[PDB]
Amino acid sequence: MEVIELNKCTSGQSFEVILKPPSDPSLEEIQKKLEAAEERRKYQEAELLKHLAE
Amino acid sequence: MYTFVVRDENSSVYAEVSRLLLATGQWKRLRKDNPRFNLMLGERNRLPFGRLGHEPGLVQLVNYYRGADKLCRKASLVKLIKTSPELSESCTWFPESYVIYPTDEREVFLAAYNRRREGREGNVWIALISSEASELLDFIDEQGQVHVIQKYLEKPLLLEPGHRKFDIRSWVLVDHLYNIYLYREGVLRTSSEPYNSANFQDKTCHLTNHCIQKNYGRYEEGNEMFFEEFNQYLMDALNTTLENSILLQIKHIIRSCLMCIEPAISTKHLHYQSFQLFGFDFMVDEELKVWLIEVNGAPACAQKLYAELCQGIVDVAISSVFPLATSIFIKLHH
Amino acid sequence: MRECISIHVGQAGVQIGNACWELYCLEHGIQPDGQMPSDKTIGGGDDSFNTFFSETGAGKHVPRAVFVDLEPTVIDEVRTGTYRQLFHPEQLITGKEDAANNYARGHYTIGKEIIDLVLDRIRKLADQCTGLQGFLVFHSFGGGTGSGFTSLLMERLSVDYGKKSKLEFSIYPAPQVSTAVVEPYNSILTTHTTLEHSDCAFMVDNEAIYDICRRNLDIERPTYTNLNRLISQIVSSITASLRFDGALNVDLTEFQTNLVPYPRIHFPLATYAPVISAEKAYHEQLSVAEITNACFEPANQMVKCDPRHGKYMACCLLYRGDVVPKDVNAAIATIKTKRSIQFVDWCPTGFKVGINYQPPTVVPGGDLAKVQRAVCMLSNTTAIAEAWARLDHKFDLMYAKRAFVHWYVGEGMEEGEFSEAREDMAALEKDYEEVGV
Amino acid sequence: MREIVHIQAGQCGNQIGAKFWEVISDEHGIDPTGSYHGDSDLQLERINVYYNEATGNKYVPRAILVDLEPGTMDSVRSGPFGQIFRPDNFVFGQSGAGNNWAKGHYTEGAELVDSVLDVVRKESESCDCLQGFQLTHSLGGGTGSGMGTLLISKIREEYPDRIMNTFSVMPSPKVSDTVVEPYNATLSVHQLVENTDETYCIDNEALYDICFRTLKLTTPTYGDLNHLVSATMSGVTTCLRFPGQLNADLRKLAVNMVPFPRLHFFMPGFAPLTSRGSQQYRALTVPELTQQMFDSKNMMAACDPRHGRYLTVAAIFRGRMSMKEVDEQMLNVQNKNSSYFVEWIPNNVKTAVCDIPPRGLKMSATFIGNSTAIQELFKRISEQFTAMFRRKAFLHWYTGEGMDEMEFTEAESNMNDLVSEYQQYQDA
Ligand SMILES: Nc1nc2c(ncn2[C@@H]2O[C@H](COP(=O)(O)OP(=O)(O)OP(=O)(O)O)[C@@H](O)[C@H]2O)c(=O)[nH]1
Ligand SMILES: COc1cc2c(c(OC)c1OC)-c1ccc(OC)c(=O)cc1[C@@H](NC(C)=O)CC2
Ligand SMILES: Nc1nc2c(ncn2[C@@H]2O[C@H](COP(=O)(O)OP(=O)(O)O)[C@@H](O)[C@H]2O)c(=O)[nH]1
Ligand SMILES: [Ca+2]
Ligand SMILES: [Mg+2]
Ligand SMILES: [Mg+2]
């Protein structure tokens, strides 16, 4: 019902209509998690090349 | 070939519906968790409405209206009738009712009870049935779960020979297009032991539930009076038909209840579609006035009428959406 | 005047970026070569459009935009396309091989090798900013780059640009519009890692956009060109307040204020009307009452769900065209009576309205017709959790048998991260549950 | 990722391999000399994938031709498209493998394997970004079976992060060279289980039956059987060779088709099925294409897909047709037969349309199925193996090249493990 906060200009206008009232990881931690994933990829490739050496 | 799923095994009505669907040869059943269905015969608790209508190249339909629990819970029905202007506090076909929480409208309940206490008129209320306000309130808190206190109908209609009590069950099908279909056949779930105006402690004559009764089966088989006999009784005893005296009010209440919740539950423009069968429960007093007791989301049919209703469900709710290779319902126009 | 940097990650992000920046140029009068004859201050200025465009001494208006893909194909079409002179080469970053629909490959393997280069080229755009407010991130939930690399970027932007706001435009996966089987995995994984790092996120279900294209434009099999030009129109509505003179949503912090009370629940539903076919000769032009009413139809929503079964936390109506406040309020009053709009008890029942007199600009030869008035509604409804539930169910189905998991594990990611991500989603669905009933 | 390096090992490998290059050279508008003479620009937009741009702007297939016998490779060189292959890429020994896996993998093959890998390395260095490798070979002989699986192993060592893709012809008594084919197959399957990402199981039994029952040819040759293979090979690689909606490579195909690393053996299919020269004139409707490609009479592996369940499906429709009708038909087969597709992988059937049709057909469909029914193929080979092995029959051919009985038992074991692993997913 109530039309508050009305602001006008050439481009357009804006307003608010109330109808009823109411009742982080670090840089060090990112480098750590990514490199732990590189180690698991390294280990799995090392296990593969060991198996292929067998 | 259309495909369906069954997710309510305990549903006696829809077990017969699936049985009839398979028998045509144009419907195949899939496993509970197969998402590639045309029809869902869903579960009572926590139905996954959010998963419907998202499977490409399939028209999807379910046997439940999402939101229709607002009509089918005792607490919800009172809240809906009191707030919705279509019904209004002044509703005349619904008994005076109040919502009480155990540890809310407790002050509103006792304000009306005092007017009844000062005037000294009929002051009996149902929740166990008692005449004392403070004796019932102590028993609600004793239970645990939230229940409703309602004005008890102290002047019911008598059935002769017997001086008995009864409630009327009517089966209502709302289709995918929001057509309201009342099944022409209803049932009178009767009391066998005569009504006692003084002793409220006895519950077998006051409560007309099919479980409590099972003098069971004295006057008619399984405490069930069908529409032809009850019409015949009203003609002989009270000089009136069931159509005029009772059924017009029944047709009014069903229509008024479902028109109220149409904008909230309707699946007219949705990605999925819904139909639902309802059980409306009515009480007729001595002046032939009809009162709404409860609405049933998952209703059970009577033994004589299973075959006809379930076939009718397939006709206007299922085959209307999924066609194959006299009408038993009265349409309530709006 | 505060500046906004747009980041486009993966195929979906880049291709939507093309569509938006095309539309932005047509709206601001900017040509394909970057010249803007209406701009009088040559070589600089602190106008409203300078939030999205920087200026050179030559008179060229250049998007504050960085395009990143792990594979060259799609950005190569930007490099050689009709807007080749608009962006300078340093803004268009490509790798050699893509993330193969694998979150873990995009996040951990190829991600690590390109993260520093991207942030360096981002830093080059931030250096030209007199006062940076933050970032708009365009990506898909489905793609390996779009899910994997994006979540890593969002993590790093929280470190390097700690104060700044971040907004998402995310593409939700749909089987109807060329998806892969593993996209439910990629979605859950990226949402979890990004949840902390995004202030406001606008989900766009590919299913919803596909059907709007079918129903309203009469296009039988919609191409990406069709879908993106539609998506861009919606995106343009959302960002219009940052590019034009106004008092509503003037900066990125105001998007949180007006739409996001609960920080985790930061997924507003976008609803848009009217979508009208260009191939429709004779069209009955729709009124303010009719287009505001279309905001509460599920057939017009960017995500197919039912707002009637749920609660509102916020609501914004953004009008473009011939609209006056009187007609808005009159429409709201009628809609309030006939429809189920339920707000949460701890929030005011209300609408923040923004009107821009300039009607929506249509792409010449596009599928959308010119309209006299159009609206975009941004509503934070608990109903959008339906899309989480659908996706979580698909995740649960595959993960029960550990299907495809080995592809993720084979890129250095732990099996534990799957269930860790899924638990967060079970937390998220519950947050919506407590607020919603 | 764009460039694929092709290898063809042995008699079968080179024969189906030569036919593949013949078929796809036609599709890209390349003559036997290597010069482009086509009309559409789309024929050249993704020609990088299989061809190296040569001097004078001529195109040379990225193919390496391998055999322990000069015979079959001499036929290729003096064949219809023989002049197109880089002469340095012809790598041959002299003694042959005598239908012996052990000769291919351990003795004769070991001598020649390094010579091959030098050419593989030289083609790899020319690659802008190497996508992966494809091998055409049989599993029943010696060279393709023994040396092929040796080559795969050695390539996996040098290029451990690259896709290995194989077209592997399965042996059958219906089309048989020697009694030792089940021995050679069982030894090779062990290797393919561990060292390939995608294997297209081309069963000779199935190819015979298609020629006999469907194509109505009374006595089919190897030429008849290979026509079906080259058509299927062209079909499966359509999205790699031609521009479309699909921005996809071999790795993406491996990710989505293989839910579990060992179960990567696919049932290929084709519609419509046709014989050489004489082909049907009546146009196939989209409903007929879909109905045929899913039918077991069109499958290149002799398995009944009704005995198992589909883990993942991929389909490539070729030609100018209604993509809406394609979608409607594809979803019709799924929604009618949903008891044969796994419920635990959502949306596991994927379709791609390419506008360019193959030579002699207005529209065609190619099928790739990761079905649990493929166990029946391995069970067949396993039964034939045990029939001879329980009596240690014909084993002296292998023990004479230094092989032990242990290796046979281990190979039989890994195959019975594979079969029971397929059985694991057919019920719950
Ligand atoms: N709306 C829209 N969706 C797209 C577009 N391109 C791709 N998608 C969707 O995004 C998902 C796949 O993500 P892509 O962006 O293609 O993949 P990517 O981010 O490049 O990652 P990789 O290719 O795996 O390295 C699918 O669900 C597609 O439906 C587009 O232009 N518009
Ligand atoms: C380059 O060749 C192909 C590569 C791929 C796919 C495919 O089947 C149409 C191919 O043709 C054989 C494809 C594969 C199967 C999948 O379904 C399980 C999937 O999710 C996903 C797809 C592809 N993606 C789409 C949207 O189709 C990605 C990988
Ligand atoms: N489909 C097909 N199968 C073949 C062809 N040539 C040989 N085979 C099969 O391959 C097996 C013999 O292997 P072969 O390739 O001759 O041995 P290699 O020369 O040592 O590799 C037998 O099962 C044959 O049926 C062919 O041209 N087409
Ligand atoms: Ca300026
Ligand atoms: Mg990509
Ligand atoms: Mg031979």
Side-chain angles (χ1 to χ4, degrees), chain A residues 1-44:
Chain A
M1 295 170 192
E2 201 175 296
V3 182
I4 60 151
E5 294 257 279
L6 174 65
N7 185 261
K8 300 177 84 193
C9 65
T10 316
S11 301
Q13 55 186 122
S14 54
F15 64 95
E16 185 178 334
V17 57
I18 296 161
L19 292 161
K20 195 138 72 76
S23 309
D24 262 55
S26 64
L27 178 66
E28 196 180 47
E29 283 159 30
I30 287 157
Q31 293 264 310
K32 193 151 275 183
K33 290 261 192 174
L34 280 171
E35 282 184 335
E38 194 182 45
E39 283 294 281
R40 284 183 290 265
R41 271 200 316 280
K42 272 186 173 74
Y43 178 78
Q44 281 155 22

Side-chain angles (χ1 to χ4, degrees), chain D residues 9-13 15-16 67-69 72 96-100 137-145 169-172 175-178 181 202 204 207 222-223 225-226 229:
Chain D
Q11 188 175 12
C12 179
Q15 267 161 25
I16 69 156
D67 210 346
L68 291 157
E69 195 176 60
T72 316
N99 289 298
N100 202 313
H137 69 144
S138 52
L139 306 196
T143 305
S145 197
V169 177
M170 305 286 168
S172 185
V175 201
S176 197
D177 285 349
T178 47
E181 286 166 5
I202 306 154
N204 264 355
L207 295 178
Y222 282 130
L225 268 61
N226 294 3
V229 180

Side-chain angles (χ1 to χ4, degrees), chain B residues 1 3 28 30-31 33-37 55-58, chain D residues 309 327 331 334-336 338-341 343 346-348:
Chain B
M1 193 90 81
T3 54
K28 197 162 196 175
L30 320 175
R31 276 140 221 154
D33 290 74
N34 197 306
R36 312 202 78 89
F37 56 81
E55 280 281 355
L58 280 170
Chain D
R309 284 170 90 211
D327 256 275
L331 298 163
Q334 298 168 70
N335 296 322
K336 262 204 159 76
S338 52
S339 59
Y340 296 113
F341 297 87
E343 70 278 316
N347 318 114
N348 61 353

Side-chain angles (χ1 to χ4, degrees), chain B residues 165-184:
Chain B
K165 209 196 196 198
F166 71 96
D167 74 281
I168 308 166
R169 159 68 61 87
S170 278
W171 295 276
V172 174
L173 184 67
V174 187
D175 68 9
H176 71 285
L177 293 154
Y178 222 86
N179 296 330
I180 298 152
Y181 293 113
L182 174 67
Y183 183 37
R184 68 194 178 190

Side-chain angles (χ1 to χ4, degrees), chain C residues 12-304:
Chain C
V14 165
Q15 285 183 169
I16 280 150
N18 293 345
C20 293
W21 290 105
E22 179 185 49
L23 197 62
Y24 291 169
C25 288
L26 287 161
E27 280 178 27
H28 292 280
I30 300 159
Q31 275 156 15
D33 48 69
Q35 288 289 301
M36 187 186 164
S38 60
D39 181 15
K40 298 298 162 200
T41 49
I42 322 291
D46 60 354
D47 293 274
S48 284
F49 65 87
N50 286 122
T51 307
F52 277 60
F53 296 90
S54 49
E55 284 173 69
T56 55
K60 192 186 266 197
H61 292 74
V62 292
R64 302 186 191 272
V66 54
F67 287 80
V68 58
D69 205 1
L70 304 180
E71 170 255 38
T73 314
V74 183
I75 292 172
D76 279 337
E77 296 217 83
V78 187
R79 280 164 184 155
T80 52
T82 61
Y83 288 95
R84 67 191 171 271
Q85 276 197 70
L86 201 75
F87 316 98
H88 59 262
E90 283 176 298
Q91 295 169 288
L92 310 160
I93 311 156
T94 56
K96 268 284 204 287
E97 59 183 329
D98 58 82
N101 295 156
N102 198 323
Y103 170 83
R105 193 172 170 94
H107 189 82
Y108 297 108
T109 312
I110 307 157
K112 201 163 173 286
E113 301 300 292
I114 209 155
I115 189 72
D116 293 355
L117 167 69
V118 173
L119 293 161
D120 191 89
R121 303 277 185 86
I122 286 172
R123 183 58 70 183
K124 276 209 189 77
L125 279 169
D127 282 352
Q128 283 185 67
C129 296
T130 56
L132 191 68
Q133 52 177 317
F135 310 97
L136 303 174
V137 188
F138 295 82
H139 72 102
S140 55
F141 279 157
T145 303
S147 71
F149 182 66
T150 306
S151 70
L152 183 71
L153 186 80
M154 291 292 277
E155 271 192 292
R156 286 294 303 274
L157 291 170
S158 297
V159 167
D160 291 38
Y161 305 90
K163 310 290 169 194
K164 284 86 178 73
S165 271
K166 296 191 289 308
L167 271 70
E168 281 187 302
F169 292 90
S170 302
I171 303 303
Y172 184 93
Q176 194 73 267
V177 199
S178 59
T179 203
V181 281
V182 294
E183 297 198 0
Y185 284 165
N186 299 325
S187 301
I188 268 84
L189 293 169
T190 200
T191 297
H192 162 64
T193 321
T194 313
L195 208 58
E196 303 272 277
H197 304 256
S198 192
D199 302 300
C200 196
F202 301 98
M203 280 203 289
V204 176
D205 190 347
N206 258 342
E207 182 195 35
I209 292 296
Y210 189 87
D211 267 298
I212 292 158
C213 276
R214 267 167 74 176
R215 198 200 312 113
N216 301 359
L217 304 173
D218 304 301
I219 303 162
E220 298 205 70
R221 227 282 188 184
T223 57
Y224 283 137
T225 311
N226 302 133
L227 307 172
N228 291 347
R229 278 207 279 250
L230 178 55
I231 293 157
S232 66
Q233 281 278 324
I234 283 96
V235 173
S236 187
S237 299
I238 299 157
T239 59
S241 58
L242 297 167
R243 288 176 291 120
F244 291 102
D245 188 26
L248 179 73
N249 302 343
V250 220
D251 90 303
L252 296 174
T253 331
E254 212 181 307
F255 279 90
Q256 303 162 241
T257 313
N258 298 344
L259 299 158
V260 182
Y262 250 82
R264 274 175 68 86
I265 301 156
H266 63 257
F267 302 90
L269 184 60
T271 319
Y272 192 89
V275 183
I276 302 303
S277 173
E279 264 65 76
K280 199 186 171 196
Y282 179 75
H283 167 71
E284 287 183 356
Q285 285 295 323
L286 295 166
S287 64
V288 168
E290 292 169 313
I291 62 157
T292 309
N293 197 49
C295 296
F296 299 88
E297 293 287 305
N300 299 308
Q301 280 154 31
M302 296 305 101
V303 188
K304 276 180 192 168

Side-chain angles (χ1 to χ4, degrees), chain B residues 38-104:
Chain B
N38 282 112
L39 171 70
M40 180 168 170
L41 303 172
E43 59 270 43
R44 281 169 64 171
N45 290 113
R46 278 261 195 167
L47 198 155
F49 288 104
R51 297 215 291 276
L52 299 164
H54 296 286
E55 280 281 355
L58 280 170
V59 182
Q60 293 196 320
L61 178 74
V62 66
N63 63 343
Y64 279 90
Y65 267 97
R66 187 186 185 184
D69 53 277
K70 283 179 205 280
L71 191 77
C72 293
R73 304 295 181 275
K74 278 166 172 68
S76 296
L77 182 70
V78 179
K79 197 212 174 184
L80 179 78
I81 284 160
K82 283 193 159 187
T83 51
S84 355
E86 307 64 315
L87 311 185
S88 73
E89 121 231 80
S90 82
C91 186
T92 71
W93 37 261
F94 192 69
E96 207 178 329
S97 303
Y98 299 96
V99 185
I100 311 297
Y101 293 87
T103 312
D104 195 283

